[PDB]
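Predicting holo structure, chloride ion bound.
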Amino acid sequence: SEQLEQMASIVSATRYLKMRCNRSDLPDEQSILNVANRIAIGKGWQSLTQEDIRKHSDDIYVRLTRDSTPEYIKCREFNRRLVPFIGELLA
Ligand SMILES: [Cl-]
Ligand SMILES: [Cl-]
Ligand SMILES: [Cl-]
Ligand SMILES: [Cl-]
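Done. Tokens:
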């Protein structure tokens, strides 16, 4: 599912920021998943569950850690790209 792929990618990138890019300001995993579930339900996505998003996000995260891009560039790319989602997270 592309909606699941999308949501899971946003959640895994946010985990990457928290774990490897010092983003102490971001909410916890439960909060992030709640917000992803809220967002999905607003977008009319009824099939997506927090467990589906969480499981796929785990798998994406592993792929992200293994990617040979320098870690600091990963951080810079995600910090720029997640600005909208982080606004929903902190709202
Ligand atoms: Cl950092
Ligand atoms: Cl759910
Ligand atoms: Cl769930
Ligand atoms: Cl590196």
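The two ends are 27 Å apart (CA to CA).
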